[PDB]
Amino acid sequence: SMTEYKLVVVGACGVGKSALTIQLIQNHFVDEYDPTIEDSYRKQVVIDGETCLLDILDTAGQEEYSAMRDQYMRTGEGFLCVFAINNTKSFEDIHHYREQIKRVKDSEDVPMVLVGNKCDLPSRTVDTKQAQDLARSYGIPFIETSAKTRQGVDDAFYTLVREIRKH
Numbered sequence: 001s002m003t004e005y006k007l008v009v010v011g012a013c014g015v016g017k018s019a020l021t022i023q024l025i026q027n028h029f030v031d032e033y034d035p036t037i038e039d040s041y042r043k044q045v046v047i048d049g050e051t052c053l054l055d056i057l058d059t060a061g062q063e064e065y066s067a068m069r070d071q072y073m074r075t076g077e078g079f080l081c082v083f084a085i086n087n088t089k090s091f092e093d094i095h096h097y098r099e100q101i102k103r104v105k106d107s108e109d110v111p112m113v114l115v116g117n118k119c120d121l122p123s124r125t126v127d128t129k130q131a132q133d134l135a136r137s138y139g140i141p142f143i144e145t146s147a148k149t150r151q152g153v154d155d156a157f158y159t160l161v162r163e164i165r166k167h
């Protein structure tokens, strides 16, 4: 049988959670996808010779989902923690996303990948060095992405599957 992986995409409003997810699922860039929509998407992929069924939850942090947030997160096997390379606040928020994931999962060994999105844009305010130092402090990988060009997007999700395997 195919190995099934429940992945959860988190991070500040506007970092590109939806754009990243829709690239993997539908192979196109969506400009300004409805920021309020939270849904799960399924995709079959081959990673290192293993057929994987991915169930990806694209979080939107809306008030209507707030009561059930912990129940939705607890079934996640791995988390993509996304910031944008032109938004320092989204990078500062990463340690808070990790605080909440560690709380819900009651563990410091939750499979996780740090993702720096929008690497196509010129006006960078967070360097790869900063993100790699943060990832190293957590013992997790860092992957740079552009949801616009699709560069690195699959590497981010596939890296998270490899982290879930180690767990």
Ligand SMILES: */C=C/C(=O)N1CCN(c2c(C#N)c(=O)n(-c3c(C)ccnc3C(C)C)c3nc(-c4c(N)c(F)c(F)c(F)c4F)c(Cl)cc23)CC1
Binding pocket: 010, 011, 012, 013, 014, 035, 036, 059, 060, 061, 062, 069, 070, 073, 093, 096, 097, 098, 100, 101, 102, 104
């Ligand atoms: C464009 C809309 C959008 O993408 N988002 C809306 C807001 N959102 C979000 C926010 C905000 N603003 C937020 O403050 N937090 C919380 C909460 C509610 C409580 C404590 N810390 C945070 C941040 C700073 C980590 C969000 N948390 C989560 C969330 C929660 N509650 C959780 F328990 C987890 F285990 C998570 F993995 C997790 F990520 C989410 Cl879904 C969304 C926000 C961002 C998205």
Ligand SMILES: Nc1nc2c(ncn2[C@@H]2O[C@H](COP(=O)(O)OP(=O)(O)O)[C@@H](O)[C@H]2O)c(=O)[nH]1
Binding pocket: 011, 012, 013, 014, 015, 016, 017, 018, 019, 020, 030, 031, 032, 033, 034, 035, 117, 118, 119, 120, 121, 145, 146, 147, 148, 149
């Ligand atoms: N140039 C560029 N724009 C992006 C990228 N990813 C997302 N966007 C845009 O950034 C905004 C926020 O993206 P969205 O996917 O809605 O973020 P979410 O709130 O995290 O789901 C939208 O206007 C997207 O079109 C990227 O890699 N490059």
Ligand SMILES: [Cl-]
Binding pocket: 061, 062, 065, 066, 069
């Ligand atoms: Cl929430």
Ligand SMILES: [Mg+2]
Binding pocket: 017, 018, 019, 033, 034, 035, 036, 037, 058, 059, 060
């Ligand atoms: Mg979204």
